[PDB]
RNA sequence: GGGGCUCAAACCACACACCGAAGCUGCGGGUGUCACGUAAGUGACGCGGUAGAGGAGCGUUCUGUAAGCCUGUGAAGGUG
RNA sequence: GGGGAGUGAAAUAGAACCUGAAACCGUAUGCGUACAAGCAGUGGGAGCCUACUUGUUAGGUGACUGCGUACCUUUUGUAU
């Protein structure tokens, strides 16, 4: 039972080279470089499913900071005043109301100033 | 007309005709769900926000489908330590169509 | 759209694409003037291939030479020939005698 | 049927093989460790 | 999904800062804040949602303590030995706007976006600016 | 003195971004009507309205 | 670290608020072990890992199953 | 050496001839590239172009931007 391994080696290399397509030069077309680029892309993608949740939070916080300062309040005073009250409303929909629904965000910052924090 | 509802441990800005993928809530296809966990309801210049929660407001939705979205890969690799490990994931969603805001 | 091909020209492909880049998209009489006065070897070869493509269009179809435009020139690589040059201190090195495939594709668009 | 019969669960085993990949448990050394006598070929300590 | 500002439909305004006795870096931090667009709820970090800042009296800017005779500004010309320095007051005599430009430039990112934001800062020397057509209004009065 | 890395396609081709050709100095005799190089005798031996060879 | 900072953007106190991790919590999945369960069936504690131990699998070629089944209305291979 | 015509079921089975992969080299189309600094990706993301049939899609490029010093082997330890 001699078994000739050239038909499975090819499909495994096609799988790696298909995962590597779009990359520069030998990163997309030779196996020993495409393999490393695919593994590295996988590590970065694991890391960046975490940093996505880190980076969007900071953007929300920066937009809420900018929207609250137009109404005469900090970010931090706003988050404190929204817990002297009870809003349970997150950084995502507050940033969305900061850009889009500005009168509702003004109502929210006035109910935070109403709790005097 | 929009509303902020808490479905899956996270909230969604939600309007009166939208389709929305939500963490998999346990109710079969085509049935109805209510969200009595609204955080604000606004209509023009009439915006009312949650005391913690807007009392007397509910959002009605219809379950459209239970799918799984778009496999992500998990690669765990230690440099020069003979360690490599891979995993697939498809996260379940429930697509709901928002039918009423009150 | 009519081709003529030379499979195996004793010039290498890199040397022939220089002249191939120089007639692409031109009118045929303009291209024949450029090739007939060029300083190179690839232009003798590619002029003979362009003459063949034009005459194929004249005899196998009914296109006039004035209407024709050289539409697709490309030079592929042919089979190399593998020879030895003896060098110093007993050392031998490989010469490749490269060849190439010239395709001229005349058309009236 | 010859198509249908197998042995008892636990009576045959798979015969895991050393040196086939790093996600198998026995890649790159095959259970032998690192440098020294008992990782060589014929790396036996006499009785 | 969250909002992304997009560089075709970004609104920009023109502003005049009167640097007539302002502290240098405390002026520069509000200028750089407004060049990046941090004061707008449409802040997106990869697009410049900033404003154009005009600064007029940029030799009346003021450093505190002993930073007038001190506070060297350095640059190396590329040739060996070619380190070159100038203090605050000889730079505010030579090129007065370069002070309030290298302050704001150092507080912007070191990006092609930071270059694009720096292009919106127009500092000048006297009490006037050539920008009456863009109609800037005064801020931090 | 060798390379420490093989050169890519891209830099190999950027080197030879300069070695393209020209020879456009052709013109037509008014008498015979044939193309020849400027300031050169024709391939049928004419030069400025006169046979020379 | 840089810009820059001087009733500080430094230091010594004290106060209140905020940000901040793959930590915790929420929400949805998978898995190990243990205990329960006419075996649907839940709970509870887990689940970084080199050498290494242990457990369970995929695929390739051959033989039986196979004088079977598929296949020129198109096999294997190759490429999407 | 080809372009036809014929033979043949098939000649991109034409004699260097079944299939005809990858490296490597081209031509064509789309998009991006000439004020921008590094393992070349990855998270975000505008724009453009194609198919659809239009949308909270599919494919292709990816300006701009946060994070980011290959793999192995050896080692107390390597971007080294």
XYZ file of C-alpha atoms (C1' of nucleotides) in Angstrom:
729
model
C 0.000 0.000 0.000
C 2.203 2.780 -1.237
C 0.169 5.979 -1.060
C 1.153 8.945 -3.180
C 0.668 12.148 -1.273
C 0.568 14.673 -4.106
C -3.204 14.975 -4.448
C -3.884 15.975 -0.810
C -0.828 18.212 -0.453
C -2.222 20.193 -3.359
C -5.651 20.725 -1.822
C -4.148 21.758 1.518
C -1.899 24.264 -0.237
C -4.873 25.569 -2.267
C -6.751 26.161 0.976
C -3.864 28.134 2.469
C -3.284 30.107 -0.750
C -6.981 30.931 -1.021
C -6.930 32.280 2.523
C -3.937 34.438 1.561
C -5.272 36.149 -1.527
C -5.129 39.910 -1.640
C -1.698 40.045 -0.026
C 1.498 41.547 -1.377
C 3.780 39.531 -3.586
C 4.925 36.224 -2.167
C 2.545 36.673 0.769
C -0.209 35.722 -1.669
C 1.446 33.267 -3.996
C 4.180 31.110 -2.435
C 3.168 28.663 0.251
C 5.903 29.124 2.849
C 5.176 32.866 3.001
C 1.414 32.687 2.505
C 1.158 30.218 5.379
C 2.830 32.615 7.793
C 0.745 35.530 6.532
C -2.464 33.535 7.081
C -1.437 32.541 10.619
C -0.460 36.134 11.374
C -3.744 37.428 10.017
C -5.474 34.962 12.325
C -3.617 36.178 15.408
C -4.338 39.809 14.564
C -7.983 38.960 13.961
C -8.258 37.276 17.356
C -6.622 40.305 18.989
C -8.816 42.681 17.092
C -12.130 41.091 17.909
C -11.085 42.407 21.381
C -9.722 45.766 20.334
C -12.875 46.386 18.282
C -14.783 46.445 21.554
C -12.075 48.673 22.974
C -11.958 51.143 20.041
C -15.672 51.653 19.546
C -16.124 52.392 23.247
C -13.524 55.166 23.083
C -15.185 56.693 20.030
C -18.560 56.692 21.759
C -17.012 58.272 24.852
C -15.287 60.941 22.749
C -18.512 61.791 20.900
C -20.504 61.943 24.138
C -17.770 64.175 25.562
C -18.106 66.495 22.565
C -21.898 66.500 22.708
C -22.032 67.130 26.445
C -19.589 70.022 26.258
C -21.905 71.792 23.805
C -24.536 71.706 26.529
C -22.142 72.805 29.276
C -21.157 69.538 30.924
C -18.238 67.149 30.833
C -18.356 63.512 29.908
C -17.584 62.529 33.474
C -20.122 64.865 35.071
C -22.672 63.552 32.567
C -21.996 59.908 33.453
C -22.180 60.795 37.142
C -25.449 62.668 36.697
C -26.930 59.802 34.705
C -26.437 57.624 37.775
C -27.676 60.085 40.354
C -30.681 59.590 38.085
C -31.117 56.126 36.606
C -30.757 56.011 32.861
C -29.239 52.523 32.120
C -28.495 53.904 28.651
C -25.216 53.075 27.037
C -22.384 54.837 25.297
C -23.511 53.494 21.911
C -27.007 54.936 21.785
C -25.857 58.126 23.526
C -23.272 58.672 20.815
C -25.969 57.887 18.238
C -28.231 60.486 19.806
C -25.264 62.842 20.027
C -24.906 62.846 16.259
C -28.407 62.180 15.015
C -31.098 63.096 17.554
C -29.617 66.196 19.174
C -32.773 67.354 20.949
C -33.108 63.988 22.693
C -29.477 64.178 23.763
C -30.168 67.677 25.052
C -33.092 66.264 27.042
C -30.781 63.604 28.489
C -28.103 66.109 29.484
C -30.762 68.295 31.082
C -31.997 65.388 33.157
C -28.397 64.783 34.171
C -27.968 68.447 35.150
C -31.315 68.182 36.953
C -29.735 65.616 39.269
C -27.065 68.352 39.826
C -24.184 65.995 39.130
C -40.614 57.516 16.231
C -37.859 55.444 17.739
C -37.104 53.519 20.899
C -34.182 52.090 22.832
C -34.900 48.499 23.899
C -32.701 46.066 25.829
C -32.815 42.642 24.182
C -29.616 40.656 24.546
C -27.636 42.291 27.286
C -27.217 45.315 25.013
C -29.517 47.936 23.606
C -30.687 48.790 20.122
C -31.830 52.101 18.692
C -35.008 50.888 17.028
C -37.569 52.424 14.659
C -41.094 51.409 13.760
C -40.408 49.231 10.719
C -36.880 47.910 11.002
C -35.295 44.491 10.666
C -32.826 43.711 13.398
C -30.482 40.870 14.285
C -30.556 40.161 18.003
C -28.912 37.559 20.251
C -30.855 34.314 20.016
C -34.026 34.697 22.033
C -35.987 31.524 22.621
C -39.234 31.951 20.701
C -40.171 30.249 17.448
C -40.382 31.731 13.959
C -43.276 34.015 13.088
C -44.452 34.555 16.656
C -44.586 37.829 18.555
C -42.337 39.308 21.219
C -42.697 42.344 23.420
C -39.936 44.462 24.925
C -41.210 46.010 28.160
C -37.616 47.135 28.796
C -37.604 50.371 26.853
C -35.129 53.069 27.821
C -36.585 55.997 25.901
C -39.373 56.692 23.438
C -39.223 59.811 21.284
C -41.680 61.336 18.810
C -40.486 64.608 17.307
C -39.876 67.067 20.115
C -41.753 64.819 22.586
C -38.953 62.708 24.052
C -39.527 60.728 27.238
C -36.647 58.836 28.799
C -36.505 55.987 31.270
C -37.078 56.665 34.957
C -34.953 53.745 34.902
C -37.434 52.533 32.272
C -40.272 54.260 30.413
C -43.344 53.007 32.258
C -46.239 52.196 29.980
C -44.269 51.647 26.776
C -43.779 48.374 24.949
C -42.187 47.497 21.627
C -43.817 44.697 19.659
C -41.764 42.632 17.246
C -42.180 39.545 15.071
C -39.538 36.829 14.866
C -38.464 36.585 11.234
C -35.697 33.965 11.254
C -33.137 32.103 13.338
C -29.864 32.120 11.443
C -26.153 32.025 12.122
C -23.958 34.792 10.776
C -20.666 34.503 9.065
C -18.037 32.193 10.594
C -15.072 33.745 12.369
C -11.826 31.838 12.801
C -9.821 31.587 15.992
C -6.090 31.005 15.643
C -3.924 30.521 18.724
C -0.220 30.335 17.960
C 2.853 30.491 20.161
C 6.093 31.386 18.376
C 8.705 28.639 18.513
C 6.833 26.725 21.255
C 5.263 23.851 19.220
C 1.789 25.258 19.880
C -0.907 25.941 17.298
C -4.671 25.641 17.671
C -7.690 26.595 15.549
C -11.432 26.938 16.075
C -14.492 28.009 14.120
C -17.417 30.043 15.391
C -20.830 30.988 14.052
C -22.890 33.075 16.448
C -26.640 32.565 16.442
C -28.885 35.495 15.731
C -32.619 36.084 15.722
C -33.884 38.491 13.099
C -36.870 40.427 14.376
C -39.049 42.955 12.599
C -40.207 45.793 14.818
C -43.963 46.167 14.431
C -45.070 48.716 17.013
C -43.694 51.411 19.313
C -45.704 52.818 22.212
C -9.417 40.116 -35.596
C -6.697 37.907 -37.083
C -3.543 36.510 -35.460
C -0.134 35.440 -36.598
C 2.234 33.664 -34.287
C 5.918 32.863 -34.211
C 6.513 29.924 -31.877
C 10.172 30.100 -31.014
C 12.064 33.208 -31.924
C 15.744 33.114 -31.094
C 15.553 36.364 -29.146
C 14.559 36.354 -25.484
C 11.177 37.614 -24.325
C 12.441 40.614 -22.335
C 14.293 41.889 -25.405
C 11.258 41.382 -27.672
C 8.683 43.075 -25.466
C 10.556 46.340 -25.913
C 9.666 46.412 -29.584
C 6.282 44.802 -28.833
C 5.415 47.732 -26.549
C 6.258 50.112 -29.362
C 3.675 49.082 -31.987
C 0.723 48.214 -29.741
C -2.445 50.097 -30.619
C -1.031 51.649 -33.769
C -2.203 51.619 -37.335
C -0.632 48.859 -39.375
C 1.203 51.068 -41.867
C 2.517 53.212 -39.024
C 3.620 50.014 -37.298
C 5.368 48.722 -40.422
C 7.198 52.019 -40.754
C 8.282 51.846 -37.116
C 9.457 48.245 -37.400
C 11.191 48.721 -40.753
C 13.421 51.495 -39.378
C 14.041 50.235 -35.860
C 17.584 49.507 -34.790
C 16.897 46.077 -33.378
C 16.570 42.355 -33.997
C 13.128 41.989 -32.482
C 11.830 44.451 -35.041
C 13.022 42.325 -37.975
C 11.308 39.323 -36.398
C 8.154 41.183 -35.364
C 7.907 42.919 -38.720
C 7.842 39.508 -40.374
C 5.141 38.395 -37.927
C 3.092 41.554 -38.573
C 3.397 41.033 -42.334
C 2.061 37.515 -41.834
C -0.899 38.718 -39.717
C -1.841 41.367 -42.265
C -1.624 38.933 -45.155
C -3.726 36.437 -43.211
C -6.372 39.134 -42.875
C -6.127 39.907 -46.598
C -6.376 36.321 -47.789
C -8.603 34.621 -45.219
C -10.947 37.610 -44.861
C -11.554 40.705 -46.914
C -10.051 43.495 -44.855
C -8.046 46.246 -46.509
C -4.590 47.016 -45.129
C -5.535 50.648 -44.564
C -8.384 49.694 -42.234
C -6.270 47.447 -40.041
C -4.989 48.284 -36.577
C -2.480 46.176 -34.686
C -4.658 45.312 -31.705
C -2.933 42.772 -29.474
C 0.803 42.201 -29.314
C 2.123 39.973 -26.600
C 5.360 38.067 -26.194
C 5.286 34.868 -24.209
C 8.350 32.823 -23.300
C 9.471 29.851 -25.346
C 11.552 26.825 -24.494
C 15.077 27.746 -23.393
C 18.151 25.817 -24.483
C 20.551 24.696 -21.770
C 24.267 25.066 -22.489
C 27.574 25.203 -20.663
C 30.174 27.916 -20.537
C 33.503 26.788 -19.045
C 34.768 29.258 -16.488
C 37.861 29.601 -14.386
C 39.295 27.287 -11.742
C 37.360 24.314 -13.102
C 33.917 25.844 -12.565
C 31.096 25.457 -15.074
C 28.052 27.686 -15.406
C 24.740 27.217 -17.183
C 23.765 29.383 -20.136
C 20.082 29.509 -21.020
C 19.459 30.437 -24.632
C 15.984 31.863 -24.295
C 13.325 31.915 -26.967
C 9.943 33.587 -27.127
C 6.523 33.477 -28.781
C 5.403 36.584 -30.667
C 1.696 37.023 -31.429
C 0.486 39.980 -33.473
C -3.309 40.273 -33.702
C -4.498 42.754 -36.354
C -8.055 44.071 -36.440
C -10.244 46.781 -37.951
C -11.870 48.181 -34.807
C -22.908 -9.473 7.428
C -19.257 -8.836 6.628
C -20.512 -5.277 6.168
C -21.804 -5.129 9.756
C -19.472 -6.650 12.321
C -16.961 -4.888 14.555
C -15.281 -5.770 17.820
C -16.051 -4.654 21.357
C -15.602 -1.005 22.347
C -12.128 -1.014 23.838
C -10.742 -4.124 22.133
C -8.797 -2.408 19.348
C -7.065 0.967 19.602
C -6.031 3.515 17.030
C -2.203 3.234 17.332
C -1.354 6.913 17.598
C 1.774 7.742 15.620
C 4.662 10.011 16.614
C 5.884 12.743 14.382
C 2.769 13.586 12.405
C 2.082 17.236 13.025
C 2.021 19.560 15.984
C -1.679 19.294 16.739
C -1.496 15.564 17.362
C 0.346 15.506 20.679
C 3.505 13.824 19.424
C 5.005 16.197 16.895
C 8.693 17.151 16.580
C 9.911 14.634 19.104
C 7.468 11.782 19.416
C 7.494 11.584 23.180
C 11.274 11.561 23.494
C 11.951 14.986 24.988
C 15.097 16.796 23.865
C 18.858 16.195 23.617
C 20.533 13.318 25.359
C 20.878 9.574 25.086
C 17.268 8.424 25.273
C 16.134 10.454 22.299
C 18.695 9.144 19.789
C 18.250 6.151 17.526
C 19.379 3.206 19.540
C 19.217 5.469 22.568
C 19.019 2.681 25.096
C 20.379 2.541 28.615
C 21.782 -0.920 29.204
C 19.967 -3.089 31.770
C -23.825 50.415 13.216
C -22.341 53.648 14.507
C -22.069 56.896 12.593
C -18.988 57.596 10.518
C -18.311 61.086 9.287
C -17.419 61.091 5.673
C -15.258 63.768 4.070
C -17.737 64.963 1.437
C -20.506 66.077 3.810
C -18.419 67.439 6.672
C -19.289 70.956 7.820
C -16.407 73.298 8.576
C -16.413 76.791 10.025
C -13.835 79.572 10.058
C -12.620 81.026 13.351
C -10.318 83.856 14.473
C -8.232 83.359 17.607
C -6.717 86.595 18.929
C -3.385 85.544 20.473
C -2.882 88.885 22.183
C -1.467 87.747 25.496
C -2.482 84.126 25.590
C -0.251 81.423 27.008
C 1.324 79.509 24.128
C 0.444 75.882 24.816
C -2.873 76.593 26.464
C -3.831 78.374 23.252
C -2.368 75.599 21.124
C -4.330 72.861 22.864
C -7.691 74.429 21.987
C -6.451 75.091 18.460
C -5.336 71.475 18.017
C -8.539 70.236 19.638
C -10.494 72.184 17.034
C -8.291 71.136 14.143
C -8.891 67.457 14.863
C -12.562 68.099 15.457
C -12.756 66.907 19.059
C -15.404 69.514 19.906
C -17.977 68.098 17.493
C -20.189 65.046 18.098
C -19.372 63.916 14.550
C -15.790 63.154 15.569
C -14.461 60.258 13.581
C -10.729 59.645 13.995
C -9.863 58.940 10.365
C -11.556 61.978 8.797
C -10.782 65.624 9.594
C -13.985 67.094 10.965
C -12.144 70.201 12.117
C -12.527 73.909 11.694
C -10.261 76.422 10.036
C -8.470 78.472 12.679
C -7.043 81.906 11.961
C -4.648 83.277 14.570
C -3.851 86.957 14.172
C -1.470 88.515 16.722
C 1.008 85.692 16.889
C 3.901 87.720 18.307
C 1.824 88.816 21.290
C 1.747 85.189 22.398
C 3.341 84.803 25.782
C 5.350 82.178 27.633
C 5.386 82.138 31.429
C 8.292 82.081 33.823
C 11.697 82.302 32.205
C 10.750 80.608 28.948
C 11.245 83.804 26.932
C 15.027 83.914 27.092
C 15.048 80.126 27.543
C 13.016 77.572 25.502
C 15.360 76.695 22.700
C 13.922 75.464 19.401
C 16.131 72.905 17.675
C 16.573 71.580 14.169
C 19.308 69.480 12.627
C 20.209 70.397 9.079
C 21.339 66.899 8.068
C 25.024 67.606 7.808
C 27.467 66.618 10.583
C 27.619 69.151 13.366
C 24.546 70.804 11.929
C 22.439 71.178 15.054
C 20.837 74.628 15.108
C 18.976 76.459 17.856
C 16.943 79.611 18.421
C 15.265 80.764 21.612
C 11.721 82.105 22.030
C 12.411 85.810 21.636
C 14.724 85.676 18.646
C 12.227 83.393 16.931
C 9.409 85.771 17.765
C 11.529 88.516 16.220
C 12.515 86.452 13.175
C 9.361 84.482 12.285
C 6.676 85.115 14.904
C 4.098 82.711 13.509
C 6.502 79.775 13.567
C 6.183 79.642 17.379
C 2.431 79.110 17.346
C 2.742 76.741 14.388
C 5.322 74.379 15.862
C 3.342 74.360 19.089
C 0.107 73.287 17.341
C 1.990 70.929 14.987
C 3.480 68.978 17.884
C 0.023 68.533 19.410
C -1.524 67.179 16.204
C -0.946 63.580 15.106
C 2.117 62.627 13.106
C -0.017 61.360 10.262
C -1.150 62.496 6.849
C -4.283 63.421 8.789
C -2.169 65.575 11.090
C -0.761 67.287 8.015
C -4.284 67.768 6.660
C -5.405 69.289 9.965
C -2.342 71.533 10.103
C -3.315 72.863 6.679
C -6.458 74.344 8.283
C -4.480 76.500 10.720
C -3.700 79.960 9.332
C -1.655 81.935 11.791
C -0.641 85.473 10.886
C 1.378 88.294 12.372
C -0.445 91.587 12.650
C -3.969 92.438 13.731
C -5.482 91.458 10.382
C -5.833 88.394 8.179
C -6.552 88.011 4.449
C -9.656 85.928 5.034
C -12.603 88.291 5.183
C -14.400 86.336 2.453
C -14.613 83.168 4.534
C -16.136 85.321 7.329
C -14.588 83.969 10.554
C -16.174 84.736 13.883
C -14.248 85.304 17.092
C -13.938 82.587 19.712
C -12.717 82.459 23.325
C -13.414 86.184 23.549
C 28.962 42.195 -3.034
C 25.609 40.497 -3.278
C 22.039 41.189 -2.370
C 20.871 40.120 1.050
C 17.336 39.679 -0.296
C 16.037 38.836 -3.711
C 14.392 41.748 -5.391
C 10.646 41.712 -5.880
C 8.690 41.905 -9.143
C 7.815 45.465 -8.309
C 11.318 46.844 -7.855
C 12.664 44.770 -10.769
C 10.040 46.422 -12.982
C 10.514 49.901 -11.515
C 14.181 49.679 -12.519
C 13.162 48.995 -16.097
C 10.558 51.764 -16.053
C 13.091 53.726 -18.134
C 14.216 51.404 -20.902
C 11.502 51.905 -23.495
C 12.325 52.863 -27.044
C 11.881 55.652 -29.600
C 13.078 56.193 -33.160
C 10.474 58.611 -34.546
C 12.521 60.542 -37.072
C 10.791 59.328 -40.229
C 9.721 61.437 -43.207
C 8.436 61.033 -46.754
C 10.154 62.075 -49.968
C 7.962 64.397 -51.989
C 9.229 62.893 -55.253
C 9.095 59.142 -54.705
C 6.693 59.003 -51.775
C 8.532 56.651 -49.445
C 9.455 56.772 -45.791
C 13.091 57.100 -44.716
C 15.027 58.481 -41.762
C 15.446 62.232 -41.468
C 18.701 63.536 -42.969
C 19.382 60.088 -44.451
C 19.410 58.644 -47.939
C 16.275 56.697 -48.773
C 16.273 52.879 -48.911
C 15.719 53.321 -52.656
C 18.696 55.686 -52.814
C 17.045 59.105 -53.092
C 17.854 62.207 -51.093
C 16.067 65.599 -51.251
C 14.499 65.159 -54.654
C 17.522 63.601 -56.312
C 18.912 60.145 -56.872
C 22.358 59.864 -55.328
C 23.052 56.118 -55.599
C 8.093 59.816 25.160
C 6.997 64.587 22.429
C 4.231 69.193 22.205
C 4.114 72.012 25.872
C 3.220 73.273 31.306
C 4.578 78.177 36.370
C -2.612 80.901 41.522
C 0.413 74.421 37.197
C -0.811 70.334 33.095
C 4.902 70.213 39.161
C 4.806 68.934 44.713
C 2.379 67.976 49.473
C -2.665 66.855 51.533
C -8.042 65.964 51.451
C -12.577 65.367 48.656
C -15.884 63.889 44.807
C -16.461 62.148 39.552
C -14.586 59.640 35.311
C -11.439 56.551 31.999
C -8.928 52.067 31.932
C -7.739 44.711 30.945
C -8.806 38.900 27.413
C -10.217 40.917 35.419
C -15.691 40.854 36.849
C -21.074 41.221 35.273
C -24.905 40.880 31.451
C -26.553 38.120 26.828
C -25.829 33.876 23.206
C -22.917 29.237 22.026
C -19.463 24.874 22.756
C -16.919 21.545 25.892
C -14.549 18.562 30.735
C -15.719 16.511 35.464
C -19.003 15.399 39.438
C -23.857 14.551 41.420
C -28.868 13.831 40.194
C -32.153 12.257 36.415
C -37.720 5.533 34.351
C -31.694 8.240 31.144
C -33.419 14.957 27.422
C -31.544 17.007 31.833
C -30.860 19.714 34.735
C -27.599 21.909 38.174
C -22.644 23.059 40.485
C -17.641 23.907 39.584
C -14.230 24.140 35.685
C -11.930 24.996 30.424
C -3.466 29.730 29.298
C 0.123 26.278 28.561
C 6.403 23.901 26.867
C 8.458 18.799 27.767
C 5.188 15.069 28.746
C 0.990 11.599 30.078
C -4.141 10.395 28.867
C -8.886 10.590 25.568
C -11.420 11.041 20.928
C -11.360 11.972 15.625
C -10.356 13.498 10.033
C -8.251 12.432 5.528
C -5.011 9.430 1.737
C -3.745 4.157 -0.760
C -4.939 -1.046 -0.660
C -8.257 -5.540 0.643
C -13.224 -7.470 2.133
C -18.195 -5.942 1.814
C -18.054 -5.990 -4.431
C -20.094 -10.395 -10.224
C -22.702 -4.752 -5.551
C -23.609 0.593 -6.516
C -22.155 4.996 -9.540
C -20.407 6.456 -14.419
C -19.740 8.101 -21.775
C -27.092 11.479 -20.421
C -19.927 11.545 -18.732
C -15.288 8.530 -13.757
C -10.645 9.934 -11.613
C -7.885 14.194 -11.974
C -7.609 19.917 -12.742
C -9.824 24.908 -11.968
C -13.803 28.249 -9.938
C 6.673 29.198 -37.639
C 1.864 30.284 -38.584
C -3.487 31.772 -40.865
C -7.187 28.973 -43.237
C -9.137 24.338 -45.578
C -9.529 19.157 -44.815
C -9.282 14.288 -41.266
C -11.233 13.008 -36.770
C -16.277 12.372 -31.787
C -12.291 15.802 -30.126
C -6.431 19.089 -33.227
C -6.290 24.358 -26.924
C -5.525 15.172 -29.385
C -0.772 18.242 -34.888
C 3.548 14.561 -33.804
C 8.209 18.221 -28.060
C 1.170 15.325 -29.356
C -3.542 11.922 -22.874
C -4.526 15.024 -18.439
C -1.885 19.333 -18.267
C -1.098 21.677 -11.350
C 2.506 25.112 -8.818
C 6.679 28.085 -9.034
C 7.963 31.781 -12.812
C 6.624 35.302 -17.300
C 2.930 38.062 -19.978
C -1.562 40.819 -22.379
C -6.571 42.908 -21.299
C -10.305 45.134 -17.872
C -11.673 47.335 -13.003
C -9.953 50.097 -8.742
C -5.984 52.059 -5.800
C -0.880 54.467 -6.218
C 4.010 60.492 -7.466
C 4.033 65.253 0.817
C 4.703 59.742 2.237
C 8.502 56.366 6.623
C 9.081 49.991 9.103
C 7.173 41.965 9.185
C 3.132 44.650 4.610
C -1.511 42.375 8.114
C -5.562 43.134 11.149
C -9.983 46.183 13.560
C -12.480 50.526 11.768
C -13.668 52.962 7.076
C -15.144 56.859 2.870
C -14.986 56.609 -2.237
C -15.226 54.163 -6.961
C -16.362 50.149 -10.375
C -19.163 45.728 -11.864
C -23.296 41.984 -11.589
C -27.823 42.206 -10.114
C -32.240 44.191 -9.030
C -32.001 48.140 -5.986
C -30.384 47.048 -0.207
C -30.280 47.106 6.353
C -27.118 42.869 -0.446
C -22.847 40.043 -3.624
C -18.055 40.513 -5.912
C -13.398 43.636 -6.795
C -10.102 47.778 -5.148
C -9.024 50.083 -0.394
C -7.821 56.767 0.306
C -7.631 57.554 5.496
C -7.008 55.545 10.487
C -6.074 52.458 15.782
C -2.976 48.174 17.007
C 1.106 45.548 14.990
C 9.591 43.784 15.139
C 8.136 36.744 9.997
C 8.570 31.286 10.659
C 11.942 27.651 12.686
C 15.618 25.671 15.891
C 18.010 26.255 20.133
C 18.136 28.406 24.736
C 17.598 31.479 31.186
C 16.289 34.256 27.254
C 15.836 36.024 20.267
C 12.594 40.985 16.043
C 17.324 39.661 16.988
